[PDB]
């Protein structure tokens, strides 16, 4: 009848103990192995309802809202009041760290100027996958082509990290309105930062389809 209750109930005790022993030989700031994620792929924010296809109507507040509150919530820690407690790292450098306490740099939200949905020039943020370590190579630059207008040590150590964002503004002028704009962003000017794969269409390149309903 209920004989399995005692058997299964205490069967998990060995399973839990073996899980516990495994969890105490790991760190909390670095994975044991990390070769599957050797280079960082790219991604577009906000994440559409469909396969990276943005679709909003300019004559509607709710149509472009689902992206506006997403961008506002995501870009909240980047604001001026929430970046005043980080050291300003030199521009163009390769800032490293070795101290027992790690602190990230400052990323001002004023970098991503101009979110243009109502104006007719929607702004979507193209991010970069975070990899623990993996210092970038050459001149990292996100090249986005359709007028397209472009503008780590761990979650525990590098606390306060603010990754470099790139904001892509695809203008919808009256002469070209209602089209399905397909932009092709890609990392350029780098060697470690891979950009060519067959099955992995996102390792370096992200392709989104922005469309405004006239």
């Amino acid at each position: 009848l209920l004989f399995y209750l005692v058997f299964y109930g205490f069967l998990a005790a060995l399973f839990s103990f073996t899980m516990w022993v495994m969890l105490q030989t790991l760190n909390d700031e670095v994975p044991k192995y990390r070769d599957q994620i050797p280079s960082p792929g790219l991604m577009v924010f906000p994440k559409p309802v469909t396969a990276l296809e943005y679709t909003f109507s300019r004559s509607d507040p709710t149509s472009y809202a689902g992206y506006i509150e997403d961008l506002k919530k995501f870009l909240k820690p980047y604001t001026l009041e929430e970046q005043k407690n980080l050291t300003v790292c030199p521009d163009g450098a390769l800032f490293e760290q070795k101290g027992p306490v790690y602190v990230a740099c400052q990323f001002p939200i004023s970098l991503l100027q101009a979110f243009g949905y109502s104006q007719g020039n929607p702004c979507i943020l193209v991010k970069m996958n975070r990899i623990i370590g993996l210092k970038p190579e050459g001149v990292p630059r996100i090249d986005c082509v359709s007028n397209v207008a472009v503008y780590y040590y761990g979650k525990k150590l590098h606390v306060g990290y603010l990754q470099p964002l790139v904001a892509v503004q695809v203008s919808f002028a009256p002469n070209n309105t209602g089209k399905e704009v397909t932009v092709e962003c890609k990392i350029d000017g780098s060697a470690n930062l891979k950009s060519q794969d067959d099955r992995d269409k996102f390792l370096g390149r992200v392709m989104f389809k922005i469309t405004a309903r006239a």
């Binding site: 073996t18 495994m22 192995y33 599957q36 991604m43 623990i132 992200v206």
Partner: protein
């Protein structure tokens, strides 16, 4: 178109053979070379690789071809529609092709292994033929019979080829092969009918000579013969068929439910179809029937090196459910190697001994009664010395014939000597062969004496059946009338000599009067005219037939195993009871009603039969016993001896035993024992001294004619029911590790621990585990101490086996695979607390920022290389863990950071392998763990 119309001289002309010695070996070899083997009958068979086509097809193996063809069609459509097609559907088709190819190779090997042994069993007992070659009686293999041989067929003998009968001493053949009639048709050397199929001078191939003797010239051997020119459920198999059906139903239910849930969970149509066909063809118990056949064939091979040749695999499992053995004394329970101990010609125990010198104890040819008895014994015997081993001692010699006859011949040679010359002096006129129905054998000879009446009568047989036809005696060479003063002494001699388990044969002779039987009197076997009654008794003969050396131990094993041993014998109720006590059939304690009527003095009619647990039943009392009267004997008595019983009453005995719900094994070595051999659940024939008819009627052949070999076969077949469950509980263990990944997937919303290709790869590596679990088996120390298995109540598969196999040895292999999955996902960053609710974003191809627990962000195609690593690790870990578990179990009882692999799935085994030892659930399930 035969030679039944030819003359005796014409047979010599046509075939070039002398009809007194046959064609000699010099031409026999040439004729064998020219025409080939006697029994050709070549059947056509499969070209072998055609069977491979059936192995790589059919059953549930065609679902994988359906899946592979669907995958290839979808690949073709995708390649035609979209440029740069995804090389995944082609790989999917290739994998489900190679899986079936490998599984079919496994099945073909596993079936050829069984077929090799099963065909090996058919050559241990070849068909034999007695041909007269070089003027001597030899026994060639039946395939060497040559057109023109001289073949002699006795009773219960398969006829080797088409014979034209030239001599026949009352021969009747069973022609049911070409007709439907089973009545024995008489055969004579005389032309009877124009049709060769209805004449009396032709005996056909494959028929049986059910009575008598004959001799013929082979006319058609291979395919020119009339036979060569013209061309089922058991409880164990039924149980394993019903179980496979219900488990297949469960498999289809689970596969359909999983396919529906996959469609609900946003699966691809082809992916979900392949998942359903990988679940169905992984949960079905394919190979269970092959494993069962492997077990049966292996254990039939094991009990053939112990002289128990089974003629089919259905007798392998019946031998093991046995609860009654009806055995025959002479040959089976006794060695049939007979030596003389005491003599009875006078009213005294006349001892005898070996070591010819000093005459053996103290006695010689002084007594004329002894002289007459010796002459009678020498003349009545048909056994003769083999013409070899002359320098060997008389006792250490080769004699062909009946064992009692051989002992008598050796005795006469040791005492008087030159029994061949003694028989030459007394030329035999007529001979009446011994029959199990007549219980006697007589002969008439010619007397070269002085006061002889010109005719001599010689008789031997059952002592009490001989005294009943004797009116005179011979004491010290003088004839006296028969009275009680000698009858009490004769019965006392039978009681003392027969009470020692010594076989006594009554010999008697009557001087045939000359005035009634002249020199040329008519002497015919049929319608006897000689005075069978009123003979002169010249004494009995007491010799030993010791029990077989391993038979008392076998009776002890039967007694401890709950098997009833019944002795059916034709000997006296005195000798039979003595032998039953000497072999242990009637054990100490239990006494016959005649024993408890003499331990305390009352008449036997005043004794309650319920006080006696042993009885000796005379065969003449069983002939007037109803079915309800034999029932009161077989169930109220634990030890039954049927003495003075003909071979035709063994049918009544086995029928009465079977009316009690027993599984009867019966022993037979004659044509008259065939209905008993065909009625019994197991029919046992004798491989040394047994008819070709009994060897056909039987389901088993005793290569040594030993009762101990039957018990050894029962002991070996008892080990089938505990090895079949180790296979039904090992084909089922792997199912839970195959279906728990998807259940946990659905419930806990975690990345998939195991995929369809790896699901179909798991059941490949774990497919031969039950097969190798039976070649490395062991034997229990109490297999022969248990009561017989009830085949109608004892079930191979029960809830206590299915529940154990699934919920105790599959839920602990599933955890050992889940450990490898969790760890391979943990070393890469994802912690088990994070891996919960992740399957919605883990499986989203357009969410390429899935947050690692250590802060990293993974692309879809980077997550689905760790996922496939987890799948492959799951498969390999489960397979290697099952193999190592097999080795550890049948060894113990009856590297770089790789602690998460096979290590834990063997560690989790250790805990329940040990903790379960504490429960000791009695109604025991700690044999497996």
């Amino acid at each position: 178109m035969d030679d039944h119309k030819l003359s005796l001289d014409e047979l010599h002309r046509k075939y070039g053979t002398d009809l007194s010695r046959g064609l000699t070996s010099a031409r026999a070899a040439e004729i064998l070379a020219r025409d080939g083997p006697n029994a050709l009958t070549p059947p056509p068979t499969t070209p072998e690789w055609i069977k491979f086509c059936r192995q790589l097809f059919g059953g549930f193996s065609m679902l994988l071809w359906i899946g592979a063809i669907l995958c290839f069609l979808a690949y073709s459509i995708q390649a035609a529609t979209e440029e740069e097609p995804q090389n995944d559907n082609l790989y999917l088709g290739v994998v489900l092709s190679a899986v079936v190819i490998i599984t079919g190779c496994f099945s073909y090997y596993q079936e050829a292994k069984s077929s090799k042994i099963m065909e090996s069993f058919k050559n241990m007992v070849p068909q034999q033929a007695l041909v007269i070659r070089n003027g001597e009686k030899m026994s060639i293999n039946a395939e060497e019979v040559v057109v023109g041989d001289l073949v002699e067929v006795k009773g219960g003998d398969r006829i080797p080829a088409d014979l034209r009968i030239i001599s026949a001493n009352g021969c009747k053949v069973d022609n049911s092969s070409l007709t439907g009639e089973s009545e024995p048709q008489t055969r004579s050397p005389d032309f009877t009918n124009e049709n060769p199929l209805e004449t009396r001078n032709i005996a056909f191939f494959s028929t049986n000579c059910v009575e008598g003797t004959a001799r013929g010239i082979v006319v058609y051997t291979g395919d020119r013969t009339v036979m060569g020119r013209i061309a089922g459920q058991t409880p164990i198999a039924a149980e394993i068929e019903h179980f496979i059906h219900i488990i297949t139903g469960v498999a289809v239910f689970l596969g359909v439910s999983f396919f529906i849930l996959s469609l609900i969970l946003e699966y691809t149509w082809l992916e979900a179809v392949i998942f359903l066909i990988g679940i169905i063809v992984a949960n079905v118990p394919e190979g269970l029937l092959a494993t069962v056949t492997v077990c049966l064939t292996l254990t039939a091979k094991r009990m053939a090196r112990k002289n128990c040749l089974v003629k089919n695999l259905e007798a392998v499992e019946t031998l093991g459910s046995t609860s009654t053995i009806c055995s025959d004394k002479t040959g089976t329970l006794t060695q049939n190697r007979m030596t003389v101990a005491h003599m009875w010609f006078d009213n005294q125990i006349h001892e005898a001994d070996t070591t010819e010198n000093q005459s053996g104890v103290s006695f010689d040819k002084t007594s004329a009664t002894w002289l007459a008895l010796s002459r009678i014994a020498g003349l009545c015997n048909r056994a003769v010395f083999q013409a070899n081993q002359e320098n060997l001692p008389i006792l250490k010699r080769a004699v062909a014939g009946d064992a009692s006859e051989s002992a008598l011949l050796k005795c006469i040679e040791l005492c008087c000597g030159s029994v061949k010359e003694m028989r030459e002096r007394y030329a035999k006129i007529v001979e009446i062969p011994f029959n199990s129905t007549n219980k006697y054998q007589l002969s008439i000879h010619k007397n070269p004496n002085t006061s002889e009446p010109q005719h001599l009568l010689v008789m031997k047989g059952a002592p009490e059946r001989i005294l009943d036809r004797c009116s005179s005696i011979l004491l010290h060479g003088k004839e006296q009338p028969l009275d009680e003063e000698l009858k009490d002494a004769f019965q006392n001699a039978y009681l003392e000599l027969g009470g020692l388990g010594e076989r006594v044969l009554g010999f008697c002779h009557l001087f045939l009067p000359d005035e009634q039987f002249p020199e040329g009197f008519q002497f015919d076997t049929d319608d006897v005219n000689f005075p069978i009654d009123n003979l002169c008794f010249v004494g009995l003969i007491s010799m030993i037939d010791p029990p077989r050396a391993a038979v008392p131990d076998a009776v002890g094993k039967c007694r401890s195993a709950g098997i009833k041993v019944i002795m059916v014998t034709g000997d006296h109720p005195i000798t039979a009871k003595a032998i039953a006590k000497g072999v242990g059939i009637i054990s100490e304690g239990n006494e016959t009603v005649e024993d408890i009527a003499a331990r305390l003095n009352i008449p036997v009619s005043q004794v309650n039969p319920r006080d006696a647990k042993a009885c000796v039943v005379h065969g003449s009392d069983l002939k007037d016993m109803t079915s309800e009267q034999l029932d009161d004997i077989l169930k109220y008595h634990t030890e039954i001896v049927f003495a003075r019983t003909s071979p035709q009453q063994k049918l009544i005995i086995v029928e009465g035993c079977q009316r009690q719900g027993a599984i009867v094994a019966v022993t037979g070595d004659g044509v008259n024992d065939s209905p008993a051999l065909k009625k019994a659940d197991i029919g046992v024939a004798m491989g040394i001294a047994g008819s070709d008819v009994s060897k056909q009627a039987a389901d088993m052949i005793l290569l040594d004619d030993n009762f101990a070999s039957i018990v050894t076969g029962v002991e070996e077949g008892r080990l089938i029911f505990d090895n079949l469950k180790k296979s039904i509980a090992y084909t089922l263990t792997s199912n839970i590790p195959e279906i728990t990944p998807f259940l946990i997937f659905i419930i806990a919303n975690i990345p998939l621990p195991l995929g369809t290709v790896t699901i179909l790869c798991i059941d490949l590596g774990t497919d031969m585990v039950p097969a190798i679990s039976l070649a490395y088996e062991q034997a229990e120390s109490d297999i022969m101490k248990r009561q017989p298995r009830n085949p109608k109540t004892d079930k191979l598969v029960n809830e206590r086996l299915i529940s154990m196999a699934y919920g105790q040895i599959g839920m602990i292999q599933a955890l050992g695979g889940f450990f490898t999955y969790f760890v391979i996902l943990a070393e890469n960053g994802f912690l088990p607390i994070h891996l919960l609710g992740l399957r919605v974003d883990w499986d989203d191809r357009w969410i390429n920022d899935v947050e690692d627990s250590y802060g990293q962000q993974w692309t879809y195609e980077q997550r689905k290389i760790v996922e496939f690593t987890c799948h492959t690790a799951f498969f390999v870990s489960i397979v290697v863990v099952q193999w190592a578990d097999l080795v550890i179990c049948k060894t113990r009882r009856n590297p770089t950071w790789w602690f998460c692999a096979f290590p834990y799935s063997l560690l989790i085994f250790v805990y329940d392998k040990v903790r379960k030892l504490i429960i000791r659930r009695r109604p025991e399930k700690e044999t497996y763990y």
